Design a protein around this ligand. Sequence first.
Ligand code: HCS
Length: 272
Amino acid sequence: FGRATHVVVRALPESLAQQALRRTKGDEVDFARAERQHQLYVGVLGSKLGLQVVQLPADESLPDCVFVEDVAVVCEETALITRPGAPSRRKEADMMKEALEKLQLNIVEMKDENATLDGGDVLFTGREFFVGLSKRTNQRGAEILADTFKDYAVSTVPVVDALHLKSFCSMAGPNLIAIGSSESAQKALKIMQQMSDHRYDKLTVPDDTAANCIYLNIPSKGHVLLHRTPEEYPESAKVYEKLKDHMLIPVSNSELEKVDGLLTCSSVLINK
Ligand SMILES: N[C@@H](CCS)C(=O)O
């Protein structure tokens, strides 16, 4: 669990600043800063952690194309190309499908026109899958996901007051689920633990979105964790900083969060 050899990312289109979908309309995006933040992210994955990076080009007609996580779910040697809940993001699947074909993965496409699924609503613990039913992912989409990864149990969780299931959680370790403290995040957590016969440890943070981090097990480095910075979320950073059992890597993501993109959203990890 957590091992990876390759990673797919995609460049930010200039259209993202003003045209990317977003639930809140607060501070406007500083595109130059967004690009800098993406460079650091890609730099850590490729140089520091040694992953082979596949950098897809931006497409101005797809303002949200940087968020590759929502277009594919990878489990072992099989990749499910999703059918995004947002119509404006459907075409993002094309280039992703091509990149994953080239990485030699077995490809399964979600073709049902009554099914939608955002990869961001999928939490794979290494033992099973939790899929959020949100405005982006419906029951049919979750059913197809279960049909694709038959060797794993797949359980649904309602997503409330957030874009995706992973807008408030992610894996921080082999048996560790990072989770937010909001009423909604905790309700979802209780449901996941109720649906699963396995007992997971939790890493609870006060800021829901800071519960989204990237966990990787890299040879020569060990258990690695990319998490949000003290500057962005001081109180959540304090929780991560206590962790002496992970190599901690604070990565800024403030600009993309303005369009609901968190850390896991900007990449699709593959273990070849
Ligand atoms: N702005 C993107 C964020 C995906 S994590 C969307 O709404 O789909």
